[PDB]
Amino acid sequence: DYSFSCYSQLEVNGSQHSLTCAFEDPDVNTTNLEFEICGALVEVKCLNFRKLQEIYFIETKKFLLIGKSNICVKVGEKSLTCKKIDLTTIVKPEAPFDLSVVYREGANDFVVTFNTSHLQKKYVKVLMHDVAYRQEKDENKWTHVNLSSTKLTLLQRKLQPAAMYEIKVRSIPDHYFKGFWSEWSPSYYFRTP
């Protein structure tokens, strides 16, 4: 079996996009395998993936982003398994940054704010953010809040007092483009009064 998944990042570096694919099952030593993609491309007809460590991927500006394209696993010449994908559906956004919580003794709440480089982009602009936070007492028990802007607020009396909280955010394409979740933004730790 040669199952594999792939995620694209539009305008990742400047105006160039990336495409990263991986093999589902962790195995096969220094494989004679290599990846390729055709269709939905411009200047060229097909492009050759590079191969770094254990992952394969490319960085072009050549993605048309209209209609599907053929991504096939190949050895020398022998084509094995292919897969017609529409890169605008497998978009993994860049993680949010500048996360920060501010406490206002005036209104008795916690203002969560963060930034995303997707706001200044041309394609994947609209995102759907997911703020998650757990308590020191608990471990794998997080509570998510699905926002749509870069500012959230949590009222004092909504979570333990004298409690220390860990908070983080991630993003996802929420509009025309579809895809997976972004990595998590580094965590912020603050203590409750």
Ligand X SMILES: *[C@@H]1O[C@H](CO)[C@@H](O[C@H]2O[C@H](CO)[C@@H](O)[C@H](O)[C@H]2NC(C)=O)[C@H](O)[C@H]1NC(C)=O
Ligand Y SMILES: *[C@@H]1O[C@H](CO)[C@@H](O[C@@H]2O[C@H](CO)[C@@H](O)[C@H](O)[C@H]2NC(C)=O)[C@H](O)[C@H]1NC(C)=O
| Sites of contact with another protein (CB under 8 A) | 15, 42-43, 61-62, 64-67, 88, 122-123, 175-177
> Of 7-15, 30-38, 83-91, 118-126, which segment contacts ligand X by CB under 6 A?
30-38
Min separation Cβ 115 and another protein, Å:
22
Q: Examine residue 115 and tell whether it contacts ligand Y (CB under 6 A).
A: yes
Say which entry of ligand X, another protein, ligand Y, none residue 15 contacts (CB below 5 to 8 A, set by partner kind).
another protein
Residue 43 touches which of another protein, ligand X, ligand Y, none (CB < 5 to 8 A by kind)? another protein
Instruction: From 6-14, 26-34, 135-143, 184-192, give the range in contact with ligand X by CB under 6 A.
Output: 26-34
Q: Is residue 25 involved in binding ligand X (CB under 6 A)?
A: no
Nearer to another protein, 123 or 190 (CB): 123
Q: Which residues contact 179 (CB under 8 A, 6 or more apart)?
A: 7, 8, 89, 90, 91, 92, 93, 172, 173
Contact call for residues 51 and 22 (beta carbons, < 8 A): no
* Nearer residue to ligand X within complex by CB, 32 or 120: 32
Residue 31 interacting partner from ligand Y, ligand X, another protein, none (CB closer than 5 to 8 Å by kind): ligand X
100 near ligand Y, rule: CB under 6 A = no
3-state secondary structure the chain: CCCEEEEEEEEEECCEEEEEEEECCCCCCCCCEEEEEECCECCCCEEECEEECCEEEEEECCECCCCCEEEEEEECCEECCCCEECHHHCECCCCCEEEEEEEECCCCEEEEEEECHHHHCCCCCCEEEEEEEEECCCCCCCEEEEECCCEEEEEHHHCCCCCEEEEEEEEEECCCCCCCCCCCCCCEEEECC
Output the six-digit token pair for 59. Answer: 């960085």
Residue 28 contact, options another protein, ligand X, ligand Y, none, Cβ 5-8 Å cut-off depending on partner type: ligand X
Residues 32-51 that bind ligand X (CB under 6 A): 32
Instruction: By CB under 6 A, name the binding residues for ligand Y.
Output: 98, 115, 117
Residues that bind ligand X (CB under 6 A): 28-32
